[PDB]
């Protein structure tokens, strides 16, 4: 996946960013079976005060997670995954769940490219990976936080 | 909704950001009935010169509004809403409409979370809000301008 | 289109940003026929270390292209266009294709506004361009780099 994570500048320490990235990655792998290394978490920082809720300028606590997924999973699974992101990002970032917004968008795998390659359909990641070139597999394997 | 608003650094003062956020929020509230506090406007600033049109580097005037919505509204209404965003942001930002781009993306409400809670179907925002806890209601209430 | 291009701060010089924007623009016009000036490339820079892959903090090389398109094109065409972006951004940015991610999202043209106007359906950009104003056409034609 690509998870775009919109946070205020300096709200998350580097270690908190790492914990939030791990929380999202583990949740995605845990519920979908996709390999760790396909989960991209891309932090987008902006100065505090760039978020407005109902026209009211916010402090730095809002977190918006925009997850970009392949089509093909059930509404039930996507609900479980969104809830798990809310719960686990809240713990990892020490931010109340009321600050956390999570939207999932989906596209056909045929118009999605990770690491320069088109993605397979959900659940087919194992044989897709095994058929990648040796150097591609090796590069991908470096991106696993156990 | 979440309205991602891509603008050049320094092109909007704090009051202009507030005015643009209110223009978008009031448009969405007025045309959809959704509660004031559910409209997030999230300003994403980048240095001027990071926008290219037809390969030509731009100054700092372009505004791209990426609105992320629940599925369920009519094409008629979404068109009214996009037009009203163009008209009212042009006034609020003192920018000519030729500089304004507005795209709406839609997702099933079942994979959309505001304030840590899954959204209802559009017209059902009152009863959704009333089944919410007292503390959750109170926190949302604080996010209503004026 | 709008192509949101997520890169690390200082990985692309002003010259490389221009070259990447032209590569993306030329790919889109070449395969879709849409005029040059409707291709927006919007660079989003963040500090290196803000990207994680599999939980591992990355350096500054990842490039994510999020393309926002009208509905209406074939899966074949979208696949050719995504591959061409990978290939041509790899050349323009001097970056291995393994670093390049490209996702296309699509919406009805009826909820998409470029230059303050609603877009036509794919393939009908000529008639759409012909039917508004002289000032608008002039402004769009300033946004054409062919070199």
From TrEMBL, chain C:
Residue sites binding (R)-lactate per the record: 28, 70, 73, 114
Organism: coryneform bacterium
Domain Tautomerase cis-CaaD-like: 1-128
SUPFAM superfamilies in the cross-refs: Tautomerase/MIF
Classification via Gene3D superfamilies: Macrophage Migration Inhibitory Factor
Protein name, per record: Cis-3-chloroacrylic acid dehalogenase
Source domain of life: Bacteria
């Amino acid at each position: 996946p690509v998870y775009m994570v919109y946070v205020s500048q300096d709200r998350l320490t580097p270690s908190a960013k790492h914990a939030v990235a791990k929380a999202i990655t583990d949740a995605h792998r845990g519920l979908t079976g996709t390999q760790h290394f396909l989960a991209q978490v891309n932090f987008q920082e902006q100065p505090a005060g760039n978020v407005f809720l109902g026209g009211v300028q916010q402090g730095g606590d809002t977190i918006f997670v925009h997850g970009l997924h392949r089509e093909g999973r059930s509404a039930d699974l996507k609900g479980q995954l969104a809830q798990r992101i809310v719960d686990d990002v809240s713990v990892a970032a020490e931010i109340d769940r009321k600050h956390i917004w999570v939207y999932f968008g989906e596209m056909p795998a045929q118009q999605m490219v990770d690491y320069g390659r088109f993605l397979p359909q959900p659940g087919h990641e194992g044989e897709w990976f095994d058929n990648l070139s040796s150097d591609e597999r090796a590069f991908m394997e470096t991106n696993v936080d156990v």
